[PDB]
Amino acid sequence: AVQQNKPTRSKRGMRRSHDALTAVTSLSVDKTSGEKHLRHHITADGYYRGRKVIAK
Amino acid sequence: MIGLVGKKVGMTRIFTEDGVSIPVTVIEVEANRVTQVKDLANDGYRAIQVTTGAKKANRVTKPEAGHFAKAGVEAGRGLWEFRLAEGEEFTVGQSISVELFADVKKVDVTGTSKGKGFAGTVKRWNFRTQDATHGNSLSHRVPGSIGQNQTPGKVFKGKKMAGQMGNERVTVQSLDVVRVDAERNLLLVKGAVPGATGSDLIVKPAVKA
Amino acid sequence: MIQEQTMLNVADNSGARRVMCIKVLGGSHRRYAGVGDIIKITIKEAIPRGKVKKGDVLKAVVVRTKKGVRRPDGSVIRFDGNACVLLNNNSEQPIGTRIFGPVTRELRSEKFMKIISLAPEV
Amino acid sequence: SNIIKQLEQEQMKQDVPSFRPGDTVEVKVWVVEGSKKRLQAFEGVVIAIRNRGLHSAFTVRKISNGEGVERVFQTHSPVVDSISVKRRGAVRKAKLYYLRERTGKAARIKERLN
Amino acid sequence: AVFQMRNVD
Amino acid sequence: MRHRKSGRQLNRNSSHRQAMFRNMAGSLVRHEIIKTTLPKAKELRRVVEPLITLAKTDSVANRRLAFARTRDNEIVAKLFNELGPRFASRAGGYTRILKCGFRAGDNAPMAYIELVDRSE
RNA sequence: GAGGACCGAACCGACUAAUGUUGAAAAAUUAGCGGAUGACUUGUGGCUGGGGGUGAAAGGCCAAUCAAACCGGGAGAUAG
RNA sequence: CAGGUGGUCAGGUAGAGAAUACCAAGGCGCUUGAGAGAACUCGGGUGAAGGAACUAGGCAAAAUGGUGCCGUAACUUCGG
RNA sequence: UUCCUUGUCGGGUAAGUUCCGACCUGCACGAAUGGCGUAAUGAUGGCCAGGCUGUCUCCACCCGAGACUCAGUGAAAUUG
RNA sequence: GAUGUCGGCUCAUCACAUCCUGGGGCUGAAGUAGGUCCCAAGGGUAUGGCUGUUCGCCAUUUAAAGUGGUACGCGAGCUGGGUUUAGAACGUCGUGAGACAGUUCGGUCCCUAUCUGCCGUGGGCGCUGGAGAACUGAGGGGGGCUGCUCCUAGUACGAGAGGACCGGAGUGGACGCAUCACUGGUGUUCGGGUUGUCAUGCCAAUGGCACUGCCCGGUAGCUAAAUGCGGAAGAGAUAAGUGCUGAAAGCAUCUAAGCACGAAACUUGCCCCGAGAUGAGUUCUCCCUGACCCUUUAAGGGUCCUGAAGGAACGUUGAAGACGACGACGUUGAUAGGCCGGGUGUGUAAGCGCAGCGAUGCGUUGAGCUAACCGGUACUAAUGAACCGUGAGGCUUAACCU
């Protein structure tokens, strides 16, 4: 249940290869206000698909 | 002879005049059509490719749509191959029907088994559970021993172990057929068949005698 | 669904009262038995004037089960309790002169003809 | 779905009388006797109805010569014949599994009388 | 905790 | 293996789900809008919406059936008397889900939920 | 109204089993258990100091260590 | 830090009761959460047929459970 | 307490190296290093039976806590 | 400067000196059934009672209940009964402390997986333009058991009794796979009954808590105890064996030349995986046909204009799923929820009226309530986009463009 030997830093790095993050790159311009926002998500100003909602 | 693509609808039953209750599984079978005829020349072996159903006109890709375009006919939901009986000779685009099943007597209904997901050693290979008590601790449904000692010193390949179950191709053999309703494209094979309801099926005549 | 170490009510005037299915005849590694399958059984209890005495060992046929007997139409004939007739150990045939209770239709199998002739029901 | 229900309703018989659970109901049963197909009666109080369309069936308990005898019967099975209701009656709770333990006088059921 | 006991083989 | 199961355990015993969705259902009514986690917000739609359907037809019996749920006379009073007629001919779609980014507290998927009209 | 009497909480004790075994805990928790007017339990404060103390006796216990406590010293003891 | 720490105050209903359940006064939701609903593990519920065939062993679970009354054997130091 | 030994016989069980009773051929019982018997008592040892049950035949499903994923913090034994 | 030690549970793997099934020889082999030996490891190869026991004995099965290797397989899988600590006693030994492969009672079984290995599932890249599918099957794995009964036939055989060889048919046991239609289980998300208490001001009606309070049922789903199927037939080449012809050796001889049969073993057939099969294969289809410099002048480095097929991301999701993946849907629209209708379960709601002093009953009423089902429905949630991926695709040789 424990290592008999110490792994190389090289071996440790190959394990980290799948740990890399990927940018969503899915941001979309608002139809009205024109501010950028994530797709299928409301704008911080509350606008969504051009209609006014929330207003907070 | 060639099989035909089918589709599970739901298990039922067909009452007989003698009063015996024989279980059956309804299987609609829209008529197949031969998109292409394979041969020893151009393809190196004789075979037919067929399709059925009605895929949405928008979701069909052009590279796929251009394949059906060669056949001159609207695209099916999918594609499946069937080996020729050697003596057979089918023209391209021919509408093969369920009527062929009237004399098949027995058939092998291929289907994809239900996905049980990941499963333990007990569910997959029917291993018996160990003692539930008598001082037992942290060991019931567990596989337990999986090898000897220093000899081999390795687990054997193909060893029965916990893993993925279901969601794989299977084929029950020599299933009996009862009714062949061409008017409704029904195929009432006797007994249970592999596959989830609404899943695609591939019925073929039994190799067994 | 008879198995090993299973008590059964006596089904005939053999003089036996309580019996137990020590063994299940008919094939290797066999477990369950019922309907009409033969089972050798010990006699754990018997009335004094009966043909059989306590501790006797002889083959016997099941006649009724709590599980019931299945039918081709899907119907099943369940019974409130298990029962069995004491066949002779040497060559079948019931020992008792009267078999109590409604024997099931599945007994129709040549050798069991003597049993079904008794008990008018079924 | 619709392909299934259409196939089932066609096999369904249209001559089944309605009956409340707990009613006394004779159940005629055709059966082979090794030759002649003589019919046989089977009277008994219903204890558990299970309607499932074509798959529908109901248990019919009967206390004969000692221990009782329960027998399920498919509503649409060829083997079953007449399903006459010999006795009007009523009980709360359609299931009657508790009657299996009750015996003799305990098994009484009052008539629905309406 | 360390315990004690004896390894009598 | 689930298979055709519906609803979600949401890491809670059913006795709490009979309560946590009972109180939250009333909060959605009182302000006609509440902020909540996305997985839970979908669960809410199967709760409040049927209650609105009960309000479609006023009767002495239905007023008590509503009382068994939500357990607040102030909330049910808005039903029938107000929320009932207001949806009128509409059938379903009483509310909508609107995701609003992830919570700063632990990257929880926040999602607004609100009534179709909102007139307060 | 007698009892080293009975059932049974507090209180005291720790028989079985699971969990825990780098634990929440250097011996506990959970589900049961024994005693519970007495050879009872407990608060507070004293007494017995190391070949000695105490012990309804296990060579147990004497500050998480006891077939001879701990601290410092002889002592950098000796070690084929 | 799921342990240890003496005394005092003793509400409502049910109950023999300081047991136990629900509540008053009052104090808390226990310093990581949000999800997904695999094995396996821990803590529980139920299970058709059989009822110790399990196992070193009825281990563990299950079951029995209150008050009033009828009635109660061998044996005995005549209290059991 | 008996090595031979699973002594022999009888009882219990379909079958009993254990249990009960007896025989005495007591390797190597024995009378205050007490013999024998004994009502009651026992978280005591062994055996049998009723009831009871997933202990088992054979596991099946469900309710919660981990396991899994995301976010925050962030160890361990071991290691030419 | 530690290799955990008997048995049991679980899980196995290999050998053949073969327990059963198969193929034969010989028989002091009539038949049935045996003896013994050869070939053959494909499959199968008991439950209990006693004892810690393996073993063994007994009871009863079975076509048979093989012999062994694998650290007398298997404690980083389990059990701690045995043995094998610290308590104690009996017998025996010693003056004694103690001891006894003599006995009895009791006595903490640690470790979150680094590598190899295995069961699964992905990311990346290559397969030489890119992409979507259908594949060919090199190779590998899985499956391979068998009784009973009947026909042949009460015939061959035999004095009687008994009772077949070959072949055929039917039906079970054990095992594997698939399935929920039935028969059942579960169903803390459905309905109802009911106990104590609290709360909603109270009557009435509901809800909270007490293991889901205790239960009685019960939809989907899952599941066996439930029901469908599977072992083969055939063929190829053989082992032991049975031969044909035929010399060496005038004869004889199965073999030396040649030729014919011959087993559940072998190769196929049966089912699954599968071109990372780098020996990276085939077939079908789809998409891309712009303008100038720099450098060590070439499979060179870039800019501008272009961004296609298709993929991915996001969202709704799924009888797919640990996470990825996979299938489906995304406004030209049934993917999910809701909704309408239906089904199913619960079994006579709430309210009112009537009958009764009352608890209660009757009528309204198979009523009310219905989760996960089925059929319909765009009410809502799936936004127009943007992202990844380009601009005709090396060299050499041959065959064709009639």
Ligand SMILES: CC[C@H]1OC(=O)[C@H](C)[C@@H](O[C@H]2C[C@@](C)(OC)[C@@H](O)[C@H](C)O2)[C@H](C)[C@@H](O[C@@H]2O[C@H](C)C[C@H](N(C)C)[C@H]2O)[C@](C)(O)C[C@@H](C)C(=O)[C@H](C)[C@@H](O)[C@]1(C)O
């Ligand atoms: C709580 C945790 C403790 O573990 C246990 O209780 C288990 C259950 C013991 O086995 C107990 C119980 C038992 C029967 O072993 C199961 C016994 O044999 C040993 C002596 O003690 C262990 C592991 C023993 O090791 C064993 O040492 C043996 C001499 C050899 C054996 N090895 C060769 C395989 C090894 O496993 C031993 C001595 O305690 C380990 C030493 C280092 C310790 O004292 C350590 C500090 C222990 O306190 C502990 C590990 O933390």
